[PDB]
Paper text:
3D classification of the data collected under ATP turnover conditions yielded structures of two additional states of the core complex bound to PhnK and in some cases PhnL. Inspection of the active site reveals clear density for both ATP and Mg2+ suggesting that this is a pre-hydrolytic ATP-bound state. Both PhnK subunits appear flexible (similar to the structure with a single PhnK subunit bound) and display a significantly lower local resolution than the rest of the complex. Meanwhile, His108 of PhnJ, which interacts with the 1,2-cyclic phosphate group of PRcP in the closed state has moved ~11 Å away from the metal ion. There are very few internal rearrangements in PhnJ and PhnH, which appear to move as near rigid bodies (rmsd = 0.6 Å between open and closed state structures of these subunits) except the PhnJ loop 37–49 that lines the active site pocket and appears to help accommodate the rearrangements around the Zn2+ ion.
In Escherichia coli, the 14-cistron phn operon encoding carbon-phosphorus lyase allows for utilisation of phosphorus from a wide range of stable phosphonate compounds containing a C-P bond. The crystal structure of a core enzyme complex, Phn(GHIJ)2, revealed a symmetrical hetero-octamer consisting of a compact, central tetramer of the PhnI and PhnG subunits each interacting individually with the more distal PhnJ and PhnH subunits. ATP hydrolysis induces drastic structural remodelling leading to opening of the core complex and reconfiguration of a metal-binding and putative active site located at the interface between the PhnI and PhnJ subunits.
Author numbering:
A (entry chain J): 3 to 250
B (entry chain H): 3 to 278
C (entry chain G): 1 to 353
D (entry chain E): 3 to 146
E (entry chain F): 2 to 194
F (entry chain C): 1 to 213
G (entry chain C): 285 to 353
Write the structure that this text describes.
């Protein structure tokens, strides 16, 4: 059965703004991307699915348990031990007053590692995995560049080996070369592991490079379920064609 | 009973509320039990939370021992002892052995605390993570969520910033295996003394109005890492009076040019050793 | 901050004995009783009652006697003594319309229904020192008139029935209690008034004077000053009906301030409010003026004077806090200064070799 | 409608003077076995004022308030609440409150205790009002 | 119609509080409240002393039907001025006998995740608290282990031994019998043994 | 037709009569003397002397008695009396080094020459009302020690000779006198100090407390 | 002590400091420090002001009669 099931999730804090009648199934090892305009509400959907925003109506199932039926402690633990979140701004997801090694090992300490040497070794290993130099582990995110900060955030999220990671356009604000290298690293990590990835992006290039299946959201409703190299090259819905033409 | 005043200087309503809070705290070790008392002005800074607890729990038959940084000769300790002599008339002693109530500021006595004793600690701040979390709304809930890893961050980065754990005062602990409590700014030397103590320890913060207690024989363990276990640096300098170096040593300044000496903080244990 | 100090018990006790012997003064003279102080130094007792927070004449006079006439120390003593008392009840809201007037004036009209009742007041006296008070004498006989009080409606009722001002309506909001929870700024007007009633008279006087001179002007008019006895009532749980427990002598000041032009309401006057124990009225007038000044966020007028600054005005009006701060600086800080000495000396070496 | 009369005589007792009340009660030579169920306690009463005299409530300090309770032999409870710290005065007021609820003492004490005290207080209030109204400022007078 | 409270409220309340603190901080210990010489029947001396020393206007009391009484309610409302409720849900100091129903106990407030001290404090009167099923106590407040054999109904025995409310949530039991009292907080590891 | 009549002078005279009756208070009590206020309300006298501008304890006590304890009213009484008197002379600048010390303390140095001397003070006292003062009594017999006073040079003299402070040296400048001419901002330090010594103590205490922030 | 602290605060201009708070504002502090002036000019509101207030009343009545009717 699909790892994550979404059924009739709707939330409209303001008229038009938000999302409605959103449903989809996500299986492990598959990357599901979301494409839409600024007002499509895809960010609201990402917040709602990641145990942050309570939907007005709908049901989200993880494994066999409803997402929002669980207690606050259960969802808080899930957001740190088995789920990952990569915000667009690394500082939002990174603790500024904590070194890179400290940020990486915060999840392990929360799990109850209680071992400075093992925590530091794991932090160095993850920094090497995300290409960050290990010599500057004691350094802090403020001194790291945008790409390095994004890599540190990815390492922090993946230190717990989560089976589901949401990514609210981490590539925003990065150069073309840096963005491409980061996307390649993300694809390598995804293929190496069996964790599902939900990527929200405002451009089709990121979905083409990383995402496996694609969905389109317009004015807060799903328009047409997509697939890599099919919607991008053979858009069916007129709005999808308009988006493709605008991108091109 | 001081003329014109209630016994122990506190109105019976504040006493009753603090007593109820103390009982709740005992039933929930390590939890900072709120109490909604009034605002009371006091001359000496120490007392906003310690004097209140002492007044709530002190009786006519108690023997009171007031301690400031381990010493009974301190001006504030003498003032508080005299205040309680005036408003309660209780007996006061210089010995941890003969005391039944020990009001202390930032120090556990060297002498082991026996049964039928209560030790009260003034707590300037009752929640250690106030230095990290500004908003208290998440602070209350994270205790139930058990998210005590955040306070581990300062311990982790202390060695990075200094090469060793320098948090020798107000070192956080986990009591009953559940609740992370921060005692008064007692030294690291005294943190071990809190492990399954025979006596009932009470902690009271006034400026925040939170009470937490450690029932006797309650397991409290220092928060640290397995790779960096909680260790107390052994003292390699003696006391200028009795010589013994088995007790935490404080510094007393003798001149205006910086000259000073080390003497046992717990003057009672110092006198016990000297008279030996 | 907090320097632990040892070895002064004997000296401290001797100093306290000296202070008490000086408070008693020369034993040839009689001992200044508390009834004498409350009867004959009534205005000092008014100020101490208002600032300390207990409307008991005898307690305030006792605190004044203990403090050797010092008002700040007496206020400290009374405020501390307030801690040992149990809150037995909360009174019904005072109805100043029922006040038994000892004095009532209005500066906004030449005459008003009820009359300009001067009452006891030092106003219009020529401040020439009276040396006959250096010996005993006899108080003047009090000329009598009609032993009746005419209807004395509040002048603001008259102004509001004309539409020139707004009635202060009761929204039912629960008053804030600083005596239970420390203030958080910005604080509601009830909290502001509670803190103003407890503020130092000589500091709120200066803030009101600054507003008058143009540091946050509010165009004040003494719309009404009243001084008289008001019945206090409670509703005990044992019973179910309101009982009258006595009367308090209090002074109420209603200021008429500059008019505004609301977007969708006729122009009207604003108003400050002051309320104090006893007949010390300059405190009530300063309270009303600073109340109007601190109403700036309510009226959406940006502050241009220190008296319009809420944090500055309220965070330092308390005598106890400022007195404790100043007293701490006296305490032995031998160690802390030694730290400063080393810090200063290094700067001297670095900038001067 | 005994609530209004009880309020009246309770207020007359509270507003009385301890000297006046004590002297008159001693003169009455009236006493019945009573027990102080509540010992006379002096605490605080919080003063509640109104903004502008008619607006929202705010707190205007505290006053001293003494309260006592007495139970008579038959079980009638008399309470007192008097501003100040005179505990014997509060006990006397509670005793009179209890007695006034007994049919034997209601009319007798109203004629001999409560009405005279109210009259004396009114007399001194009227005298003070005369002295105060001597200070009135006159501007205009009707002329025929 | 009214019952006399502590002869000396201040010192008697302080002594009762110290005895209750000894009982609570050391679960299983038996302490005697010699202060009050006569309880408010059907309440025993221990329950009356606890209510007098702890109950006030901020502590609603829920007397159970067998223990609820007009004289008891009047005396409690007079001496302590504490509000009186009739449903266990809103109680803060619940009082019940060995006939306590399982539903009544389950309705008692146990606290909250953010306010674990906001729950009720059940007080239980028993015929005796020394003769009954053997019970071993350990945990916070216990030196090594204490043996108590009090006469509890099956419902509260199940609650103690199989506490369904996770720490810090849970009520704090107070056994009472005549002058003698015993305290079992929510943190006591209690087993049948 | 509401003919205007005169009631002003007869109003203020009656008001002042009522005020003096209130001042005398209950007549069954002895009228408190100026000497009693001077000897026992000595801190009120000190404040009135400092703010009123005349260092005359009897005059300050008289002002307090005439003001019904109102410190501001007594201060203004003494200030108005200042205008009555003529300036007979100007003293030589005061020498505080030759003080006969009732009290001498320092918070920076422990071993100050001349020794620390707490003297009469309210410091370290418990703010507990002494209800025994509701009745007559007498203060405890004073303890005695050595009767000699050692020389007591200023602490700032030590700080200056150590290079940590600057010695305040007189340049011979003529002090400003606000009592002769109105203040003209900006003011010299002499004018500021003269004004401050006359400043209300509550206002200055609040300003000092605000400088902490 | 309060006089010493306020004197040091008012020494700002000669130390080349910037007034951060009213206490260091020379004119505000000194103009209102005098007890007699502040007390007199606050208590003077008890003086009749019906001539001045009548001028205010006339303007407000004219403003009310034009804002609405
Ligand atoms: Zn030693
Ligand atoms: Zn300090
Ligand atoms: Zn004017």
């Amino acid at each position: 059965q699909p790892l994550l099931s979404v059924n009739n999730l709707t939330h409209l804090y303001a008229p038009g703004k938000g999302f409605s009648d959103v449903s989809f199934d996500l299986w492990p090892g598959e990357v599901l991307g979301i494409v839409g305009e600024s007002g499509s509400g895809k960010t609201t959907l990402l917040k709602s699915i990641s145990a942050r925003l309570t939907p007005q109506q709908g049901e989200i199932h993880y494994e066999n348990r409803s997402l929002y039926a669980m207690s606050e402690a259960d969802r808080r633990r899930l957001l740190r031990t088995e789920w990952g979140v990569v915000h667009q701004h690394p500082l939002d997801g990174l603790r500024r007053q904590v070194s890179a090694g400290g940020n990486i090992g915060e999840r392990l300490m929360a799990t109850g590692a209680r071992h400075y040497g093992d925590i530091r070794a794991t932090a160095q290993k993850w920094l090497e995995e995300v290409e960050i130099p290990a010599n500057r582990i004691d350094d802090l995110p403020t001194t790291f560049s945008g790409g390095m900060q994004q890599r540190l955030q990815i390492a922090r999220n993946l230190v717990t080996h989560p089976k589901l990671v949401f990514m609210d356009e981490p590539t925003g604000g990065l150069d073309v070369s840096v963005q491409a290298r980061l996307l390649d690293l993300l694809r390598g990590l995804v293929v190496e592991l069996n964790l599902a990835v939900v990527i929200v992006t405002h451009d089709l290039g990121v979905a083409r490079l990383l995402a496996d299946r694609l969905l389109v959201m317009k004015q807060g409703q799903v328009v047409e379920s997509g697939l890599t190299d099919r919607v991008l090259d053979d858009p069916h819905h007129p709005y999808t064609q308009l988006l493709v033409s605008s991108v091109l | 009973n001081l003329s014109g005043y209630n016994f122990a200087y506190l109105d019976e309503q504040t006493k009753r509320m603090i007593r109820r809070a103390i009982l709740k705290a005992v039933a929930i070790p390590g939890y900072q039990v709120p109490f909604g008392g009034r605002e009371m002005p006091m001359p000496y800074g120490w007392g906003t939370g310690g004097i209140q607890l002492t007044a709530s729990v002190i009786g006519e038959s108690d023997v009171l021992k007031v301690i400031d940084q381990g010493a009974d000769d301190t001006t504030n300790a003498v003032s508080i002892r005299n205040f309680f002599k005036r408003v309660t008339g209780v007996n006061t002693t210089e010995r941890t052995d003969d005391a039944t109530l020990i009001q202390t500021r930032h120090r556990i006595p060297e002498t082991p605390l026996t049964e039928d004793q209560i030790i009260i600690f003034q707590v300037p701040i009752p929640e250690p993570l106030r230095f990290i979390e500004p908003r208290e709304t998440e602070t209350r809930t994270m205790h139930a969520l058990e998210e005590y890893g955040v306070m581990q961050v300062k311990l982790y980065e202390d060695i990075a910033r200094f090469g060793h754990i320098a948090t020798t005062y107000a070192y956080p602990v986990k009591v009953n295996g559940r609740y992370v409590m921060d005692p008064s700014p007692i030294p690291k030397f005294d943190n071990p003394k809190m492990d399954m103590m025979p006596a009932l320890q009470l902690f009271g913060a006034g400026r925040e109005k939170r009470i937490y207690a450690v029932p006797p024989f309650t397991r409290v363990e220092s928060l640290d890492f397995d790779d960096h276990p909680f260790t107390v640096q052994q003292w390699d300098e003696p006391c200028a009076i009795c010589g013994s170096t088995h007790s935490y040593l404080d510094e007393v300044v003798l001149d205006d040019a910086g000259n000073r000496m080390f003497v046992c903080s717990d003057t009672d244990y110092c006198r016990q050793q000297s008279e030996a | 901050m907090y320097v632990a100090v040892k070895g002064g018990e004997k000296a401290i006790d001797a100093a306290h004995a000296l202070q008490e012997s000086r408070r008693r003064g020369d034993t040839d003279l009689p001992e200044l009783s508390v009834a004498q102080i409350e009867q004959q130094l009534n205005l000092a007792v008014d100020r101490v009652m208002t600032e300390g927070g207990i409307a008991d004449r005898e307690l305030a006079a006792l605190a004044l006697k203990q403090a050797s006439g010092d008002n700040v120390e007496a206020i400290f003593l009374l405020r501390a003594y307030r801690t040992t008392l149990a809150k037995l009840a909360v009174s019904e809201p005072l109805d100043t319309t029922g006040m038994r007037l000892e004095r009532r004036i209005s500066a906004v009209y030449k005459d008003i229904p009820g009359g300009q009742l001067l009452g006891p007041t030092y106003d219009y006296t020529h401040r020439l020192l009276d040396f006959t008070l250096l010996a005993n004498g006899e108080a003047p006989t009090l000329t009598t008139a009609d032993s009746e009080q005419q209807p004395s409606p509040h002048v603001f009722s008259l102004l509001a029935r004309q539409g020139l001002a707004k009635f202060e309506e009761d929204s039912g909001a629960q008053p804030d209690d600083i005596t239970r929870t420390p203030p958080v700024y910005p604080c509601s007007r009830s909290s502001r008034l509670q803190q103003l009633m407890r503020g130092d008279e000589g500091y709120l006087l200066a803030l009101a004077y600054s507003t008058q001179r143009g540091y946050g002007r509010n165009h004040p008019f003494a719309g009404e000053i009243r001084s008289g006895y008001i019945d206090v009532s409670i509703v005990p749980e044992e019973l179910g009906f309101a009982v009258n427990v006595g009367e308090l002598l209090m002074t109420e000041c209603e200021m008429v301030n500059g008019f505004i032009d609301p977007p969708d309401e006729p122009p009207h006057f604003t108003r400050g409010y002051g309320l104090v124990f006893g007949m010390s009225e300059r405190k009530a007038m300063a309270m009303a003026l600073v109340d109007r000044a601190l109403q700036a966020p309510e009226y959406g007028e940006h502050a241009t004077g220190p008296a319009q600054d809420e944090e500055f005005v309220l965070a330092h009006a308390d005598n106890v806090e400022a007195a404790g701060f100043v007293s701490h600086l006296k305490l032995p800080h031998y160690v802390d200064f030694q730290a400063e000495l080393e810090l200063l000396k290094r700067l001297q070496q670095e900038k001067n070799h | 409608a005994d609530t209004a009369t009880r309020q009246h005589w309770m207020s007359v007792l509270a507003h009385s003077q301890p000297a006046e009340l004590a002297a008159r009660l001693n003169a009455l030579n009236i006493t019945a076995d009573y027990e102080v169920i509540r010992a006379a306690e002096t605490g605080l009463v919080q003063i509640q004022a109104r903004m502008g005299g008619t607006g929202e409530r705010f707190f205007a300090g505290d006053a001293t308030l003494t309260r006592a309770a007495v139970r008579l032999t038959d079980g009638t409870l008399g309470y007192s609440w008097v501003l100040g710290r005179d505990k014997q005065h509060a006990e006397r007021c509670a005793l009179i409150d209890a007695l006034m609820q007994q049919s034997r003492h209601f009319q007798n004490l109203s004629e001999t205790l409560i009405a005279p005290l109210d009259a004396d207080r009114m007399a001194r209030i009227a005298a003070r009002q005369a002295e105060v109204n001597a200070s009135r400022v006159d501007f205009f007078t009707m002329v025929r | 119609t009214l019952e006399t409270a502590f002869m000396l409220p201040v010192q008697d309340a302080q002594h009762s509080f110290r005895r209750l603190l000894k009982a609570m901080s050391e679960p299983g210990v038996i302490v005697a409240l010699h202060q009050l010489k006569r309880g408010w029947q059907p309440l025993n001396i221990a329950t009356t002393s606890v209510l007098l020393t702890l109950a006030d206007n901020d502590t609603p009391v829920w007397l159970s039907t067998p223990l609820n009484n007009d004289i008891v309610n009047q005396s409690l409302r007079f001496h302590t001025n504490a509000p009186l409720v009739s449903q266990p849900e809103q109680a803060t100091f619940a009082v019940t006998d060995e006939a306590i129903s399982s539903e009544q106990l389950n309705a008692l407030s146990t606290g909250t995740a953010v306010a674990p001290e906001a729950g009720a404090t059940l007080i239980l009167q028993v015929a005796s608290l020394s003769g009954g099923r053997m019970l071993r106590l350990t945990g916070a407040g216990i030196a090594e282990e204490r043996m108590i054999a009090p006469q509890l109904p099956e419902c509260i025995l199940h609650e103690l031994t199989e506490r369904p409310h996770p720490f810090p949530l849970g009520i704090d039991l107070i056994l009472t019998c005549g002058e003698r009292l015993l305290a079992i907080p929510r943190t006591t590891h209690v087993e049948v043994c």
